[PDB]
Amino acid sequence: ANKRNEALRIESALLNKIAMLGTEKTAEAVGVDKSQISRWKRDWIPKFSMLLAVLEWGVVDDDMARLARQVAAILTNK
Amino acid sequence: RANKRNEALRIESALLNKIAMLGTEKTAEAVGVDKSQISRWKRDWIPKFSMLLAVLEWGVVDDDMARLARQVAAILTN
Amino acid sequence: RNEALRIESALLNKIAMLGTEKTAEAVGVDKSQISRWKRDWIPKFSMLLAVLEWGVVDDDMARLARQVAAILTNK
Amino acid sequence: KRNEALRIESALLNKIAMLGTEKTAEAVGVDKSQISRWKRDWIPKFSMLLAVLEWGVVDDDMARLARQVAAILT
C-alpha cells in the first residue's frame, strides 16, 4: 500500500536525480564503472529506495514541507 | 577542504541512526535481505548510498535541526 | 503534567540549538545515550525544575523564531 | 570557568532543601533509598547541562542556525 507506493516514490526521485546530474557524473562522482552502475539501478536502487520509505523519510520531507510552506502561510496570508 | 565527503557523512549518520532506531525491527523486507539480516550489508552500500544521496544533493534534515524548525515553525504559527 | 513539560520543551530546544551532539559531548551524554537522555532524563529534570519552581525560559528560542523571521520575512 | 556547573547544583540543592527534600522528591517522583542517589549523579549532570546550555551560543552561531532552520522552513 503506502510503504510500497512511497518507496517506489523514492525510487523515482532517485532515478530522476541521477538523470539530472548525469548518469555518468552520478557514477564517477560515486564509483561503479559505466557497465556495473546503470543495470545496478535495475536491481539495487529499488531495494534501498524502500528503505528510505521505511524511515518515513517522507513525513520528515513532507512535514519539513508541510510546516515549511505552512509558515510560508503567515507570509501568504497572515 | 570538503564539498561532498562531509555530507555523504552527515546523511550516512541519520541513516544507520534509523536502520537501528527503526532498523532490524523491520529492515529484511524493508530491503529484502540475504539469508536473514546483515549490518555487513550496510558497510557495503550505505556508505556508497549516502554518497549518492549526497551527490544527488538529496534531502538533509538534521534530526535536532528538524525540531528547531518545528519549534520555530510553531512559534510562527502560534 | 506540570510546566515540567514546558521546561522539557525548553531544554530540548537549547540542546537542539547548541547541537544534540556537541551538547552531549559537552555534557556527560555520549551518542550511545542521547535518546535515553532525551526521553527519561530531560523529562525527569524538567519536573524537578517545575517542582523547584526554578523557571529558566526560552529566550534564545525566541531569537531564532524571530531571526528566521528576519531572513524568511524578507526574500 | 565551568565550575559554573557547581554554582548551579548549589542553587538547585538550595531550592530543593528550602522546599523539602521529600515534599520535592514526590513533587517530581522518586523515593527515599534512591532519593539520595539523585542528589549526586543526576543533579550535577543537570547542572552541567544547565551550565552548557548556559554558554553564549553567539550571534554567528545563532546565524548558521537561523539560516538553515529557515532554509527548511521554505
UniProtKB/Swiss-Prot annotation, chain B:
Lambda-imm434 is a hybrid of bacteriophages 434 and lambda. The cII protein coding region is in the lambda portion of the imm434 genome. One of its GO terms (molecular function) is DNA binding. Homotetramer. Interacts with cIII; this interaction is essential to stabilize cII that would otherwise be quickly degraded by host protease FtsH. Transmembrane segments: none annotated. The keyword DNA-binding applies. Acts as a transcriptional activator that allows virus to initiate a latent state. Following infection, participates, together with cIII, in activation of the Pe and Pi promoters, which are responsible for the transcription of the cI (repressor) and int (integrase) genes, respectively. Both of these gene products are required for the establishment of latency. GO terms for biological process: regulation of DNA-templated transcription; viral latency. Keywords: Activator, DNA-binding, Early protein, Transcription, Transcription regulation, Viral latency, Viral latency initiation and maintenance. It comes from the Viruses. This is Transcriptional activator II. It comes from Escherichia phage lambda. Residues 24-43 bind DNA. Belongs to the lambda phage cII protein family. The chain holds residues 3 to 80 of 97 of the full protein.
Swiss-Prot record, chain D:
Signal peptide: none annotated. One of its GO terms (molecular function) is DNA binding. Keywords: Activator, DNA-binding, Early protein, Transcription, Transcription regulation, Viral latency, Viral latency initiation and maintenance. GO terms for biological process: regulation of DNA-templated transcription; viral latency. Residues 21-40 bind DNA. It comes from the Viruses. Homotetramer. Interacts with cIII; this interaction is essential to stabilize cII that would otherwise be quickly degraded by host protease FtsH. Belongs to the lambda phage cII protein family. Lambda-imm434 is a hybrid of bacteriophages 434 and lambda. The cII protein coding region is in the lambda portion of the imm434 genome. Acts as a transcriptional activator that allows virus to initiate a latent state. Following infection, participates, together with cIII, in activation of the Pe and Pi promoters, which are responsible for the transcription of the cI (repressor) and int (integrase) genes, respectively. Both of these gene products are required for the establishment of latency. This is Transcriptional activator II. It comes from Escherichia phage lambda. The gene is cII.
